[PDB]
């Protein structure tokens, strides 16, 4: 995924997908065959992370004709957003592992003279990473267990299996004698509401629409919540990219043991940039604005208190 979207070929995608299927728990999944990966728009300016999409093939069934392409497009939009969030969540884990390993390999073995300043800078960096991880985890928890799960249980499970009580079902017609039954006892009663074709299409369309057009994900400071969230995500991306430079500088400090003063100055400069600009100047300001924005909404006040 590091290389541009034009470089990735079909064979590499197939190798990646098969290896990931073997590693994970999907290899025992009943319909593991149906899974298939693809790249949507192989533009030069788009990297692999910005184009990869997982596609669940249901073309072999007549059900695919009920599900119009618009619904699938809204299923690939929401997947794209969630894919970005989880990409950042995992990048922070890799950051944690690499910095923790560097702590044992270099800093703790360094000379006692300059060990303390480097230890302090490393602790600052890791604490910033911890703050970002907490924020991302809270956002993912809110989406997963208040938007996707609630909408599923409310619009699919409760529409199909529980009774769709209506004003016509209220009337008990057995006040009429109605001794007869038709067409015959041979016709089953099926534990699920009998839905028309248009009813099935509308049911799945409403279920998808509720998720994609939720309170947080709508397009409605005259700015939408999505834009603020994406701005915070860009802040985290910048943090990761700068932390990689800090990684290279500190490992070059480890390798050295007149250059020491230059490297120490660069370390101070990088620490100042990350601590002041990215975190204090950008992240805390954006999060304060977002928290104040959320309190104006009754639904999102609870999320604001945590997130």
């Amino acid at each position: 995924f590091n290389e541009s979207s034009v470089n990735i070929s079909s064979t590499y995608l197939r190798k990646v997908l098969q290896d990931a299927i073997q590693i994970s728990s999907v290899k025992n999944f009943e319909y593991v065959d149906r899974l298939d990966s693809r790249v949507l728009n192989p533009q030069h300016g788009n990297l692999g992370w910005e184009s990869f999409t997982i596609e669940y093939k249901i073309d072999d069934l007549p059900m695919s004709y009920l599900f119009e392409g618009h619904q699938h497009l809204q299923y690939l939009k929401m997947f794209h957003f969630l894919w970005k969030l989880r990409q950042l969540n995992n990048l922070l884990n890799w950051h944690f592992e690499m910095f923790n390993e560097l702590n044992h390999n270099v800093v703790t073995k360094l000379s006692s003279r300059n060990r303390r300043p480097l230890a302090k800078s490393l602790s600052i960096i890791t604490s910033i990473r911890f703050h970002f991880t907490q924020f991302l985890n809270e956002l993912i928890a809110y989406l997963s267990y208040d938007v996707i799960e609630e909408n599923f249980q409310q619009h699919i499970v409760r529409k199909l299996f529980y009774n769709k009580n209506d004003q016509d079902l209220l009337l008990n017609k057995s006040f009429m004698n109605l001794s007869e039954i038709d067409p015959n006892n041979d016709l089953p009663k099926f534990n699920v509401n009998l839905l028309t074709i248009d009813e099935l299409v509308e049911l799945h369309g409403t279920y998808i629409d509720s998720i994609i057009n939720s309170s947080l994900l709508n397009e409605k400071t005259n700015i939408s919540y999505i834009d603020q969230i994406f701005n915070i995500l860009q802040t985290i991306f910048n943090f990761i990219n700068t932390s990689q430079e800090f990684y290279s500088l500190v490992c070059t400090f480890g390798l050295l043991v007149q250059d020491q003063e230059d490297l120490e100055f660069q370390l101070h400069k990088i620490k100042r940039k990350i601590y002041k600009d990215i975190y204090q100047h950008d992240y805390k300001r954006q999060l304060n604005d977002l928290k104040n924005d959320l309190n104006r909404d009754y639904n999102l006040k609870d999320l604001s208190k945590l997130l």
């Binding site: 070929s9 064979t11 590499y12 197939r14 190798k15 065959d33 073309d59 072999d60 004709y65």
Partner: protein, 443 residues
Amino acid sequence: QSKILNTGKYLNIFKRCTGLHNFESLKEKLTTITSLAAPDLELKIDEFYHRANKMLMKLLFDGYNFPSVVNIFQRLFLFADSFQIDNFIDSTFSELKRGKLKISVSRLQKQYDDIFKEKIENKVGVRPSVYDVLKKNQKLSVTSESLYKVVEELMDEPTITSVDLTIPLPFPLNLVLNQQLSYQYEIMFKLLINIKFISKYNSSNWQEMNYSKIWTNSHFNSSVKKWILRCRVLHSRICSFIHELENYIVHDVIEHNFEEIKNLIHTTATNLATSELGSDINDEGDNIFNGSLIRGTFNNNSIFDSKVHKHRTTTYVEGISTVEQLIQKFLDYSSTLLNDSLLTREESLRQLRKMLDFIFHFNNYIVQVKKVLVLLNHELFNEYSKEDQESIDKRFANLSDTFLMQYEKFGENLVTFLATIKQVGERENQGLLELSNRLELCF
């Protein structure tokens, strides 16, 4: 249209094969098409087509023992049992390496039949095996179309480049083993015989290089000793490269793909074993009449037939159920064998042709070297001459440049071949990518 035509053809094949004049013996209950305006015409056609497939499938599998014909084709064409072909190459090693026209063609036929189609007869009434029937059918003949020329169309040299094997088939078996499938099998036969022959040339040359008296002689001077050591190491590299290439082609391409077909055919055989012959079709009185005629030009439902698509068929559930899929599976298998092998692209084929030519010519050069080494050392020159310093120095100087040329040519060919495999594997073929990784990890 296809269903009607194929149903009729399949019933005709059954009647002509088993000899029945009509299907009275099966005593099955059948329903005929009452009218052209009936609503169940498509259902009736589908049922008839399924009946025809059921009968022809059971004929082929249970009666004609097709599953064993698949293993027989595997053995004879792709050397799933390489003992016999190894004996054949060993017996005619001197002939096969000679130019096409410089050797008698009729001898190869006989020297092949003594190896392959040998026989012991069985008493009257004892059933012949299908292998017994197909052994005597096969014929190996030399053809004018060389491998590198015949494969270029579907984009003297030593006789090995032009020896082919053909197997005519009984009716109806030849309908499933269509000529296009047998031709794709023949191409693989020619490729594998080339590689097997070169491996047999790499082993014999390895036997002389190590243990023949001239090469193993201890009384050479230091320079000739180091020259011999360099030559032995280079030949070891060539041997390892050829064994790696053969391993990929035979285990990573042929056997790996064949496992799927073997499993599918076993499943189909088990499915048909428990299935009766002949199916009963019933129907109601069909009182619809005017409610079904729909006379006129046509209905507006024709659009739905074109709107739907039937390109989604997979999972090979319950084995192969239609003879068309039975043929399609083997056609796909043969296409996979040709595509995976380095014969489909132009870059891969050209690099393979250069590599094989270079190895063969190197073996011939090794053979001609044996004569030169006699003159260099004295202790054995006197023995061989029974039947000057400047000249000896000239001979060694000539061998220096010749051997260096071969060494550098090998390096060039190897580099180009690896680059070509890497690009093709990254672009199209998954199987070639792992071969590229293995060969790169080798050198």
